[PDB]
Amino acid sequence: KTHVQLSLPVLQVRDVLVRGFGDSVEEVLSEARQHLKDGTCGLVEVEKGVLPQLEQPYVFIKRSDAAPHGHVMVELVAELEGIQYGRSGETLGVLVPHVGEIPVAYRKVLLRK
């Protein structure tokens, strides 16, 4: 199916054990598409002093369409040394590996896949 409905846990930053997905953008955009379809992908909301606490290259999720079934449209976007690769709308947060972290909140989305 072109698209897919998912429900990412929102994790508090101070408990993310694995603080990112890789060392090359190509690699964070692959472990991260992968821990998704396996339901092992969390989401940290961006606020101040959050993004210093996570390993680059960052994988964002960003609104790509102002929303079927109450699930937003998003696509991945990697960020490394100021350059975003991929083009997209509103940062809904950054994707990290969830490995047990108790959430505070789920976020429905819809993945161009």
Residue 74's alpha-carbon distances to 18, 23, 42, 65, 89, in angstroms, are 23, 23, 15, 7, 8
CATH of domain 5-111: 2.30.30
Method by which the model was determined: X-ray
**Distance (Å, whole) CA 5 – CA 109:** 6
Contact between 59 and 5 under an 8 Å Cβ cutoff? The reply is no
* Those residues with Cβ within 8 angstroms of residue 47's Cβ, 6 or more apart along the chain or in another chain: none
Q: Which two tokens stand for residue 95?
A: 């994707």
**Distance (Å, whole) CA 5 – CA 110:** 5
Residue 91 β-bridge partners: 62
Q: Which residue has the tokens 């975003």?
A: 84
Q: Which of 33, 80, 29, 32 is nearest to 55 (CA)?
A: 80
Q: Where are the domains of the chain?
A: 5-111
